[PDB]
Amino acid sequence: LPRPSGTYAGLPIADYGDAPPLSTKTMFWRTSPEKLPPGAWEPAYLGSKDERVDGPSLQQVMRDQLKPYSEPRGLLPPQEILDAVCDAIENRLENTLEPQKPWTFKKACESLDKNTSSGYPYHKQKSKDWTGSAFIGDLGDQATHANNMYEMGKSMRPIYTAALKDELVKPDKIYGKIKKRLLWGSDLGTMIRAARAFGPFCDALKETCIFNPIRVGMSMNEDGPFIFARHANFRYHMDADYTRWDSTQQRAILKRAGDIMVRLSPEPDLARVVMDDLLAPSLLDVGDYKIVVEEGLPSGCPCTTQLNSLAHWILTLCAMVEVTRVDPDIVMQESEFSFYGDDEVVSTNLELDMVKYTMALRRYGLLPTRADKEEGPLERRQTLQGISFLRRAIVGDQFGWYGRLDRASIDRQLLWTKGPNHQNPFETLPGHAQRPSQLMALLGEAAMHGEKYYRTVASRVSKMVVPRHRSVLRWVRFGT
Amino acid sequence: LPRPSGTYAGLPIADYGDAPPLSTKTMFWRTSPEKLPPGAWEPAYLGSKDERVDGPSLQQVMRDQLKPYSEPRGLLPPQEILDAVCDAIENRLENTLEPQKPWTFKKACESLDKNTSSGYPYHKQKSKDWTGSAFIGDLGDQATHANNMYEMGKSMRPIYTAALKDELVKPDKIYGKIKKRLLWGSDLGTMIRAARAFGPFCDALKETCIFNPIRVGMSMNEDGPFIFARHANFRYHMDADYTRWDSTQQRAILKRAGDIMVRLSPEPDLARVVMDDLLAPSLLDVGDYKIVVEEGLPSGCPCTTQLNSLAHWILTLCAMVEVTRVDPDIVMQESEFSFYGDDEVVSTNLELDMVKYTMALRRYGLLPTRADKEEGPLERRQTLQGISFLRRAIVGDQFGWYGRLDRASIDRQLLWTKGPNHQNPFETLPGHAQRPSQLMALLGEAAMHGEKYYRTVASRVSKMVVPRHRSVLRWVRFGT
Ligand SMILES: O=c1ccn([C@@H]2O[C@H](CO)[C@@H](O)[C@H]2O)c(=S)[nH]1
Numbered sequence: 001l002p003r004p005s006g007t008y009a010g011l012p013i014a015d016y017g018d019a020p021p022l023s024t025k026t027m028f029w030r031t032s033p034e035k036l037p038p039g040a041w042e043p044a045y046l047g048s049k050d051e052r053v054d055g056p057s058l059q060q061v062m063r064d065q066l067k068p069y070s071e072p073r074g075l076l077p078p079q080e081i082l083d084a085v086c087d088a089i090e091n092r093l094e095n096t097l098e099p100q101k102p103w104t105f106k107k108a109c110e111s112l113d114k115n116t117s118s119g120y121p122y123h124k125q126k127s128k129d130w131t132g133s134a135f136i137g138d139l140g141d142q143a144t145h146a147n148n149m150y151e152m153g154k155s156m157r158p159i160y161t162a163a164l165k166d167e168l169v170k171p172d173k174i175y176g177k178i179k180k181r182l183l184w185g186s187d188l189g190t191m192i193r194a195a196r197a198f199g200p201f202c203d204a205l206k207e208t209c210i211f212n213p214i215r216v217g218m219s220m221n222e223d224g225p226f227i228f229a230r231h232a233n234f235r236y237h238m239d240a241d242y243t244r245w246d247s248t249q250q251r252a253i254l255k256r257a258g259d260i261m262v263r264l265s266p267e268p269d270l271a272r273v274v275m276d277d278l279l280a281p282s283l284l285d286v287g288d289y290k291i292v293v294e295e296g297l298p299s300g301c302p303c304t305t306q307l308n309s310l311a312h313w314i315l316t317l318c319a320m321v322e323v324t325r326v327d328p329d330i331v332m333q334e335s336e337f338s339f340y341g342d343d344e345v346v347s348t349n350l351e352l353d354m355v356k357y358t359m360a361l362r363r364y365g366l367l368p369t370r371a372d373k374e375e376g377p378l379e380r381r382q383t384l385q386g387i388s389f390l391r392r393a394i395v396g397d398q399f400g401w402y403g404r405l406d407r408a409s410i411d412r413q414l415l416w417t418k419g420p421n422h423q424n425p426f427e428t429l430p431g432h433a434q435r436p437s438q439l440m441a442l443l444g445e446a447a448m449h450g451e452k453y454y455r456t457v458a459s460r461v462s463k464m465v466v467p468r469h470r471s472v473l474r475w476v477r478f479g480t
Numbered sequence: 481l482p483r484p485s486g487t488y489a490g491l492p493i494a495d496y497g498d499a500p501p502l503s504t505k506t507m508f509w510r511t512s513p514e515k516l517p518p519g520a521w522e523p524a525y526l527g528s529k530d531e532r533v534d535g536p537s538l539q540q541v542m543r544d545q546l547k548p549y550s551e552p553r554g555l556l557p558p559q560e561i562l563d564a565v566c567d568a569i570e571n572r573l574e575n576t577l578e579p580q581k582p583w584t585f586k587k588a589c590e591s592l593d594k595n596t597s598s599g600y601p602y603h604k605q606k607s608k609d610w611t612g613s614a615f616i617g618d619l620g621d622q623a624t625h626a627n628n629m630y631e632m633g634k635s636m637r638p639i640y641t642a643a644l645k646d647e648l649v650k651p652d653k654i655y656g657k658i659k660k661r662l663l664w665g666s667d668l669g670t671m672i673r674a675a676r677a678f679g680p681f682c683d684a685l686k687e688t689c690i691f692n693p694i695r696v697g698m699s700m701n702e703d704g705p706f707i708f709a710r711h712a713n714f715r716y717h718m719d720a721d722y723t724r725w726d727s728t729q730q731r732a733i734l735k736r737a738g739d740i741m742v743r744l745s746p747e748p749d750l751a752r753v754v755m756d757d758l759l760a761p762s763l764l765d766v767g768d769y770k771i772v773v774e775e776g777l778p779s780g781c782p783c784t785t786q787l788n789s790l791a792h793w794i795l796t797l798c799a800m801v802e803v804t805r806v807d808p809d810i811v812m813q814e815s816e817f818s819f820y821g822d823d824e825v826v827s828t829n830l831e832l833d834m835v836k837y838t839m840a841l842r843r844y845g846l847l848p849t850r851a852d853k854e855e856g857p858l859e860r861r862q863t864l865q866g867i868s869f870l871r872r873a874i875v876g877d878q879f880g881w882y883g884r885l886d887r888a889s890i891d892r893q894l895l896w897t898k899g900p901n902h903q904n905p906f907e908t909l910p911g912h913a914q915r916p917s918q919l920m921a922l923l924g925e926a927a928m929h930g931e932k933y934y935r936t937v938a939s940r941v942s943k944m945v946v947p948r949h950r951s952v953l954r955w956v957r958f959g960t
């Protein structure tokens with residue numbers, strides 16, 4: 001079975017791998033030597049060297065993350081519905097988005113995050129070869145070549161590098177069945193091409209985050225109250241709370257999302273070439289091998305989150321159109337959506353059979369879940385209160401709607417702080433100076449839950465100094 | 481009956497008058513020599529020299545405007561309700577407004593509109609004595625003295641100068657029963673004192689125009705959609721459409737509004753003195769005499785509109801509290817208000833007996849009116865669509881809510897343009913250059929009513945040049 005040859009984690013091997021070994025470190029440190037202890041979240045599992053527990057290798061942990069990508073896809077929504085949905089979404093974006101100028105090579109390079117890695121093949125921090133206005137040395141070569149390919153409309157095969165997310169998790173994912181989330185890291189070449197191709201559209205969409213349902217680019221504090229006020233114009237509210245959103249995606253769906261992006265781009269012919277590269281079967285470097293991934297979402301590119309939100313919008317509209325039999329453009333007259341990758345809040349005036357809705361979703365291969373369990377139809381409520389979005393609870397009072405971080409999460413940020421990578425999470429940062437500057441984003445947030453809880457959080461102690469009690473509340477809710 | 485002596489237009493004469501003779505001119509010119517003709521609004525009546533019609537003197541016209549001020553007041557709302565309402569409104573503002581720094585003399589002077597008159601006693605355009613950072617000559621003296629009085633917390637008697645509003649009106653107010661609206665022009669001294677005293681509060685309130693119901697300072701384009709989205713969170717919508725709001729006000733009500741402003745000011749002791757001057761019986765210079773006006777709203781001061789909106793809020797809450805029996809702070813949990821002087825939109829979840837509501841209002845001496853007539857309870861609707869605010873119709877679609885100028889009004893601005901004062905409205909501006917610069921605020925606005933009407937308005941002709949057809953629509957609705 002000559003190349004692609006053999007098999008890794010159920011998937012075809014296309015080549016030898018060049019990725020660096022998976023990180024054994026976390027960026028999180030304890031803020032105090034006192035113990036947590038009980039049920040407290042901690043940084044995700046760090047592998048064989050993880051003093052906290054004996055467990056499998058990070059590569060084993062990663063293989064587990066790769067399983068869903070070889071699961072069979074769910075079904076396409078009915079073709080007539082899918083087409084009608086895409087047309088409606090496309091028409092809505094046509095009416096809302098300000099046509100943009102093409103992005104230059106310069107604009108694309110500047111847009112990139114200089115603190116993250118360049119991925120294949122040099123795997124170096126982008127800032128290393130960055131003069132401030134251009135890439136130099138190795139990265140300069142990789143970037144210029146890609147840009148030349150982009151301008152000639154020539155295809156390039158993206159190469160993603162796999163990683164595991166360093167993040168706080170519930171202890172069970174450490175001390176029980178070990179789990180750590182899969183990350184896809186794009187290559188500099190692809191970042192350049194995707195940014196030139198799609199930066200214009202993504203900018204246009206972002207200027208539009210209040211009027212359109214794709215909320216990528218919103219400030220929870222500043223925009224949340226308006227977005228939520230809009231959702232509240234409608235009778236019914238729900239959140240499908242998806243499991244494994246990315247790995248359950250159909251390239252067939254991603255390609256329709258991609259078609260909309262291409263057609264709404266200022267260089268659609270150049271953009272088309274890039275998008276075809278992005279959605280073609282994916283080369284994923286897992287260290288030993290580069291394996292072929294045909295299905296699911298390939299992430300880590302600039303406009304991934306928008307692409308992913310777009311697919312979500314398509315699927316969500318498909319299910320509602322399937323179930324209610326209402327035209328997608330009419331569904332959008334009678335509803336307000338919020339999408340951020342797999343994150344969603346759906347509000348609507350329509351009478352939606354939640355059994356048929358939950359089943360339509362499942363049929364597409366998605367995994368919606370009840371806040372509790374037993375599937376078992378999704379919930380539908382008549383108030384917005386208590387629904388969540390971007391990790392905040394949506395709250396409403398006489399002044400308006402807002403997003404509020406729960407106390408658990410606020411408490412959590414008190415126990416942990418970011419700093420350089422190290423091996424033992426329980427170590428405290430030794431020169432425990434200042435959570436900036438800012439990070440009194442808690443207090444107000446903490447705040448928000450009332451004077452009683454706010455007071456106890458005012459043990460923002462260090463070590464200058466006060467107060468700032470305690471109509472920080474006024475400042476957070478209304479501001480400036 | 482020694483001073484105050486005799487009587488003018490039903491009101492006591494306190495002194496001889498110093499006001500300049502009422503204007504005989506309009507600032508409006510026709511945009512074309514073609515006739516209007518039928519039913520077309522025109523500039524209000526210009527008096528004896530008005531070639532269009534033979535009519536009474538402007539002073540007679542003004543006397544008619546003064547009648548309502550000697551009408552008996554309506555009744556105070558029940559004292560327990562009034563107190564509870566004031567407390568609730570005060571508490572709401574306490575929770576929302578950012579405490580402010582006191583305004584300096586400099587800040588107060590700069591805030592004044594330099595293009596309008598200084599009123600009593602010099603009656604000159606403010607810009608005449610304005611170096612750019614200070615008042616000089618006569619105005620400098622008047623301003624410094626007032627500021628000294630303000631700082632010593634000493635009282636001064638305001639002197640208002642009466643005028644008649646130059647504005648487009650329906651022809652019946654010209655060719656039928658002649659009518660022209662009364663204006664009160666404050667004196668520079670009082671403007672200084674009111675601005676130092678109340679500029680801080682008014683700034684604070686204005687920063688708050690989306691979260692609080694007093695909408696003074698809103699941009700219809702930018703803020704309208706959010707304000708309206710909020711109103712739309714509620715089941716029922718209404719507009720009391722008041723006749724003669726200002727002249728029907730009770731000083732007793734204005735004084736409670738004033739108390740809130742004083743208490744929320746950074747120099748409440750100094751502010752109190754000013755507010756007592758502002759609400760004490762009013763000296764109104766009508767030319768021949770200064771007459772005493774005890775009742776109704778005395779306008780023309782800086783923060784009049786906020787004071788007036790505040791009273792409106794008090795009265796509106798009183799009526800709803802009287803009728804529903806719900807606590808005012810609870811009424812505000814279940815409702816969204818918009819007030820701008822006499823202009824209002826009231827939205828609420830509560831079940832309001834519209835007969836009892838209309839009667840409560842009338843009892844306070846207000847004159848609510850049905851969009852048609854026959855009083856006859858006010859209307860209550862279950863959609864926002866079709867309600868008006870700041871002269872715009874509130875419109876909703878799949879993208880959101882917005883304010884839209886009606887076609888009549890758009891047509892109107894095509895027939896007339898502003899320019900220097902002249903005697904014959906039908907004259908066209910002879911060097912018919914450019915409606916700026918801008919004023920393509922029509923087109924988009926005109927727009928908004930669809931391509932069909934938008935096309936016909938594109939006779940924006942002059943005389944360079946195009947187009948700008950015709951997703952100006954996109955630009956007006958979403959912008960920037
Ligand atoms: O709230 C979020 C934020 C990001 N992502 C997606 O998760 C992947 C990165 O972890 C990318 O595909 C993102 O679009 C999701 S699914 N939900």
Ligand SMILES: O=c1ccn([C@@H]2O[C@H](CO)[C@@H](O)[C@H]2O)c(=S)[nH]1
Pocket residue numbers: 663725726777778779780784785786788820821822823
């Ligand atoms: O929409 C408006 C705008 C202004 N005013 C008031 O009208 C007077 C000036 O004509 C002042 O008392 C203003 O507060 C009113 S009543 N409604």
Ligand SMILES: [Mg+2]
Pocket residue numbers: 239241343344345388389390
């Ligand atoms: Mg959600």
Ligand SMILES: [Mg+2]
Pocket residue numbers: 719721823824825868869870
């Ligand atoms: Mg109104």
